[PDB]
Write an enzyme that holds these catalytic residues in place. Sequence first.
Site, PDB file in Angstrom:
ATOM      1  N   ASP A  35       0.824  -1.204   0.000  1.00 27.58           N
ATOM      2  CA  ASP A  35       0.000   0.000   0.000  1.00 27.58           C
ATOM      3  C   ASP A  35       0.859   1.256   0.000  1.00 27.58           C
ATOM      4  O   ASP A  35       1.370   1.661   1.054  1.00 27.58           O
ATOM      5  CB  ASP A  35      -0.895  -0.029   1.245  1.00 27.58           C
ATOM      6  CG  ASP A  35      -1.797   1.186   1.361  1.00 27.58           C
ATOM      7  OD1 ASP A  35      -1.942   1.912   0.359  1.00 27.58           O
ATOM      8  OD2 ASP A  35      -2.379   1.375   2.461  1.00 27.58           O
ATOM      9  N   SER A 199      -0.832  15.524 -12.083  1.00 31.62           N
ATOM     10  CA  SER A 199      -1.095  15.143 -13.459  1.00 31.62           C
ATOM     11  C   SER A 199      -1.359  16.390 -14.298  1.00 31.62           C
ATOM     12  O   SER A 199      -1.903  17.378 -13.813  1.00 31.62           O
ATOM     13  CB  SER A 199      -2.298  14.193 -13.516  1.00 31.62           C
ATOM     14  OG  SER A 199      -2.719  13.967 -14.846  1.00 31.62           O
TER      15      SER A 199
END
Length: 330
Positions: A35, A199
């Site tokens: 994770d 992004s």
Amino acid sequence: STGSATTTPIDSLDDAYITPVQIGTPAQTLNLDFDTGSSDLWVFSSETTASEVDGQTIYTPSKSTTAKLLSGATWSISYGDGSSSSGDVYTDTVSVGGLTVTGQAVESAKKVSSSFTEDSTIDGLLGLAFSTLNTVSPTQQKTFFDNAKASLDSPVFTADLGYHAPGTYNFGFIDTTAYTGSITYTAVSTKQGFWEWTSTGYAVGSGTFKSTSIDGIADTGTTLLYLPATVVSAYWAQVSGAKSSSSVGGYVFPCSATLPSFTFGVGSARIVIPGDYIDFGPISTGSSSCFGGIQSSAGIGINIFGDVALKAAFVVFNGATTPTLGFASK
């Protein structure tokens, strides 16, 4: 040194991925959920409340000649999906894919919430976010990657998750045969303890690319792709019959649909998520309403590039002094 381990979806929908991890001496192999959005290595154990164990493999520290109780240390964590666990701490030898760390903090669960109990395939989590998020008290502990870093050939790990198929986590090297083209690297902020990046935009299907900054985290421990409501609405508007359902808890769509792809920007590069990756199947057995793999982050408080996005790429978690993230097509 290096390590290389195969990671395997837990079910037919890629709800999560498990990677075998050797703990203790002699080795006890547990299947952990790696994770990158948390920083605790915790396991089901011989100390876990018996009624809260249902099929998982447990770590038994008393059977490990290298286990040592970390005196006074406790831990307690809550995850984004509302699940939680807590317990005490041992140090022991931990190996992943041939890479060994001695003196790793292994957090032994005394209690786990129902969602962990109900998932027989996950024996614990191995956190790969920054050690500043580790919950051990009163002495915070380091992640497996942090402990291994100095010994690694290169201070990196890579995630290469499969779509309905196994994939690979590598430590300490970049497998140049595992991706196509080049790796595009992008800046990381560690300010919130995550692999947080921005992004450069998105496209839906064959549509034009929208240049827009989307700050979010690369999180292997989250199943879906969580993005701003504007972006998500633009995606689902291209699927006839798709709608946001408050009763179900997100966007659903007719199972008869053909889903469009979703592209996200990494600098000037583009990662394309095929439409099929966005299908999470019937909302309940036998239903013709299917659950979407792109969902709104509104009310999460953060955008999350979860498995839906990451599995479309070869992803480099670069833990150099100034960390960065790299993405390649594959």
